[PDB]
């Protein structure tokens, strides 16, 4: 979690294994794709309630209607004074919420990891964990996905 | 910021008509008087002539024109200074026009006055120029407002004490 | 619901490149996968590539590997094609799919298709 | 004019403003002159302003 | 930075008979003064509640 990867792709999170049956990258498809989607939704929405149907053709006034043009101009000046700050402000908070939105996903993952990695696997901070038994291809995936077989292992304890 | 000027000379403007403006409603340190920036004309020894002056702006910032038609109450005191029952009122100019007519009629008492005087305004580009006509119910321009723009400025409603 | 449009049928002279468009009803911002499939007439299937999601990774079968390049407008919710080279083996029909998720997994939704025949 | 149709109709007219008293009667005859039109929802009445103007 | 002040606010006036000038120029001009203060609490009552959690 210290640091982000470049040589993973297909996926904002995933994990990693250094097993003697090989050593490579791999994604979380379940999660990767579920954050996907609110972030979808998410811009989805705000181009929806950003509607632009409308007239917009500019009027002119003569001389003697100084008073009409300045309250014509003050019109449109003061919309798009007011639409810059929404655009801004709803663009700006929204990202902080996704910053935030990919932090909690990560963080909880690598906690629903722990859950189904007991303390068979000797945690050691830096976003990893140090294995007490042997594990093949068929057990690393078992912690990748949603199935685990930990009373089968009781090395060391 | 302006730059108040004489558009039309007294001495030398009307040298055919009365120039002296008296009016009590206007009175000044408690007697006849009259408005600073305009004039009131009449007909001397009986006679209106017909008056054709024009105004050329030979300035690159425009010039603020004040003119205004005089309304008698009744036709006593309209024969009695223009000696014409009727008189009309023309200015004209490069984009601007327009003919008065003087509406004679008793008015209810304001001012302790009967006839009315309206006034009116119009602005000269550089280079442009003004022609006025009439043959009674006149109020001549005597100064004229040449304005410069300028960005912040405005009008304010206030008591507050200067400091 | 959603429905998967493709450009209209297209004729090309040999050795030319075409160009197909496929877009989806509705097309706001998107990230499903999509692909391409050929058709030979009176043949099976027979599998061309894909995009993944927003990753935007790209992958082609070894048979060309250089002649079929697709990229993904997904704020249009678009896929495109600049397939090149082309030949008389080549005459066949394209389709374009989509998996349902930002990988390049199997896929259940289909477009109309396109014929695309090549001769002078 | 009666409008025989179904959509509206813009209709134009222009009123001559003559310098002086010499073209105002070598053009129409009348050193007083009117002219008028008048619709069911609209009329008004207009006259020459015949004065020198600048050029 | 986004609460951006530069503008003329000088106020007009109008006669009697534009009394339907004084009454749409009144909305406009009360119409951005309620949309500035809900955006100006809504803005700092927002981010305060982020900074509480933030620190
Ligand atoms: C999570 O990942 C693990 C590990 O990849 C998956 O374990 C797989 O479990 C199935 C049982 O349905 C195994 O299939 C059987 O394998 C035995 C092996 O001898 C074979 O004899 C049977 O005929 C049958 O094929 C599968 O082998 C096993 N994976 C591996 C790599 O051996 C588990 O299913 C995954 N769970 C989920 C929910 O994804
Ligand atoms: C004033 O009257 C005299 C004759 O009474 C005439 O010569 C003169 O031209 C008149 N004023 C002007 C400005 O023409
Ligand atoms: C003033 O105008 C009237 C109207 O045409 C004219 O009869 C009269 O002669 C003019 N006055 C002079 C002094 O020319």
Redesign the interface.
């Known amino acids: 979690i210290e640091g982000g990867w470049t040589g993973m ?3 904002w999170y995933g994990y990693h294994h250094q097993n003697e049956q090989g050593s490579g990258y791999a994604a979380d ?1 379940k999660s ?2 579920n954050a ?1 989607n609110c ?2 939704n998410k ?2 929405s705000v ?1 929806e309630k950003m509607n632009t149907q409308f007239t917009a053709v500019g009027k002119e006034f003569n ?1 003697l209607e100084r ?1 009409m043009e ?2 014509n101009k ?2 449109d ?2 919309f798009l ?2 639409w810059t ?2 655009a ?2 709803l663009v700006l ?1 929204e990202n ?1 919420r996704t910053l935030d939105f990919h932090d909690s996903n990560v963080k909880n993952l690598y906690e629903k990891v722990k859950s189904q990695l007991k303390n068979n696997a000797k945690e050691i901070g830096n976003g990893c964990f140090e294995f007490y038994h042997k594990c093949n291809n068929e057990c690393m995936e078992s912690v990748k996905n949603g199935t685990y077989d930990y009373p089968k292992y009781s090395e060391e304890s | 910021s302006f730059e108040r000027f004489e558009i039309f000379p007294k001495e030398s403007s009307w040298p055919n008509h009365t120039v002296t403006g008296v009016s009590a409603s206007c009175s000044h340190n408690g007697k006849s008087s009259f408005y600073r920036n305009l004039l009131w004309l009449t007909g001397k020894n009986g006679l209106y002539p017909n008056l054709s002056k024009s105004y050329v702006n030979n300035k690159e910032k425009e010039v603020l024109v004040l003119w205004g038609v005089h309304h008698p109450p009744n036709i006593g005191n309209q024969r009695a200074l223009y000696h014409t029952e009727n008189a009309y009122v023309s200015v004209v100019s490069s984009h601007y026009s327009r003919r008065f007519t003087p509406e004679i009629a008793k008015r209810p008492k304001v001012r302790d006055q009967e006839g009315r005087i309206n006034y009116y305004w119009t602005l000269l580009e550089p280079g442009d120029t003004i022609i006025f006509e009439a043959n009674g119910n006149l109020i001549a321009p005597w100064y004229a407002f040449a304005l410069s723009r300028g960005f912040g400025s405005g009008i304010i409603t206030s008591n507050a004490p200067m400091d | 619901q959603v429905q998967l449009v493709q450009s209209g049928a297209e004729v090309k002279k040999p050795g030319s490149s075409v160009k197909v468009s496929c877009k989806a009803s509705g097309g706001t911002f998107s990230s499903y996968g999509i692909s391409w499939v050929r058709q030979a007439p009176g043949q099976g299937l027979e599998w061309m590539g894909g995009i993944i999601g927003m990753f935007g990774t790209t992958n082609y079968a070894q048979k060309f590997q250089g002649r079929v390049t697709i990229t993904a407008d997904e704020f249009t919710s678009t896929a495109y094609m600049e397939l090149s080279s082309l030949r008389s083996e080549d005459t066949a029909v394209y389709y374009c799919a989509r998996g349902g998720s930002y990988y390049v997994d199997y896929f259940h939704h289909w477009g109309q298709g396109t014929l695309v025949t090549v001769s002078s």
């Open positions: 792709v297909d996926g498809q990767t794709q996907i972030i979808t811009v989805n181009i001389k008073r300045n309250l003050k019109v000046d003061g004074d007011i700050y929404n801004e402000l908070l902080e």
